[PDB]
From a paper:
We selected a humanised Fab fragment, FabT, which binds and potently neutralises human TNFα as an acceptor scaffold. The unmodified FabT fragment bound TNF with a KD of 221 pM and did not bind either HSA or MSA (data not shown). To determine whether the CDR conformations of FabT-aHSA and FabT-aMSA align with those of FabT, attempts were made to crystallize all three proteins. Conditions for crystallization were identified for FabT and FabT-aHSA but not for FabT-aMSA. FabT crystallized in the space group P1 21 1 with three copies in the asymmetric unit. The structure was determined by molecular replacement using the coordinates of an unpublished in-house Fab.
Numbering used by the authors:
A (entry chain A): 1 to 222
B (entry chain B): 1 to 213
The structure:
Amino acid sequence: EVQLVESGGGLVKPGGSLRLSCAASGYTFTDNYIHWVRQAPGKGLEWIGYINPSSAYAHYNEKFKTRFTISVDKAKNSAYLQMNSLRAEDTAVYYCTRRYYSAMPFAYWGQGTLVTVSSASTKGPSVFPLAPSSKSTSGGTAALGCLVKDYFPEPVTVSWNSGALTSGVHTFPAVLQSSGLYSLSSVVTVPSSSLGTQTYICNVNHKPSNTKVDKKVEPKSC
Amino acid sequence: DIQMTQSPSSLSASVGDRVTITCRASEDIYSGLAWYQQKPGKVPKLLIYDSSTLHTGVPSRFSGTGSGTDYTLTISSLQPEDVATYFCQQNYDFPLTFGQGTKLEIKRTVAAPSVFIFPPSDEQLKSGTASVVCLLNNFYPREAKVQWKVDNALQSGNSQESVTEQDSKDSTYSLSSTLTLSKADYEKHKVYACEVTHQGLSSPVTKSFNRGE
């Protein structure tokens, strides 16, 4: 239908600059403004500003003018959020959004893109299997998973079987290790009777390190 | 700017309860008020606009009321899929401003956890670290005690826990406890066990394995 798709997040150093993009589809781009909103724990949701794609006129929350600039490229049906002179406390999920229609609230949201402002370096994860065994199988159900360890910054995404397996999946919130790197596990419960005929692959993506790993999780003989 | 104050910041209630969340603006916004619902990690979803009109697809148990500075969101009969954080937003003057959110949790009946353990993978051991994962699946309430014992010696300081968001269908939780050791420390011991205490279990449950087996 109407869709907004963001790109460009990830890691940036304090004082640095970063540009996000918002590609609009499913409607005539110039018929509605594009707005930008961010979300972080503590200050919550904050509205940054809008741009009118027909005139390229942008209007801002005064609070944000020193670090944020909104622009458009009509040829690409895209709006952009340019960030400058970023502070560590500007770490947040950034959304583009569109009104339902003129003067109405926001019915359509981009997926959100986390921007992490930090001096630490990017690190891609290692992916290890959590293989089903007699110790994770009971009552006709087997649990299996993937351990995704030692990455920075957030986030990693995990899918199973390229998105075809969603039922029974638990992808846990990441924990911060004392090393300063993150870890998480993703687990799924499936029939124990099916382990010999079905294939279970965890698809791990860590965009900041350009890491994409597929790990086939095979049963353990214990 | 117009400041939006929501109350309460969090609440928990049972299926079938009538729940109310309030939003107060620092000045009259003349019914120019929206409500959004957000699940963890997901986008906000528009629920209500013009203070009392439900958006496409929103169940009739939701309602919005109020005028002037004071507005209310009411869920007439709470359902498990209503677990979420709810935000108000004034749409009357720029800058657009949002309330701080109300996190809504569900109370329900006891459900005992299924307990599973995963020894470290051969792949990880080749690199010099050993992670042992204990999984408590689909249980209620969230409170649970997980203890690690290595050759029957109680561990402390080498594990971390993570709990899932509450399930949108059955209101249960899952929990991981991960014990991390250097490969050398791991090879100093034989028996690795996760002991789980929970209200739904008549006695503590232990899942265990022997290193190297």
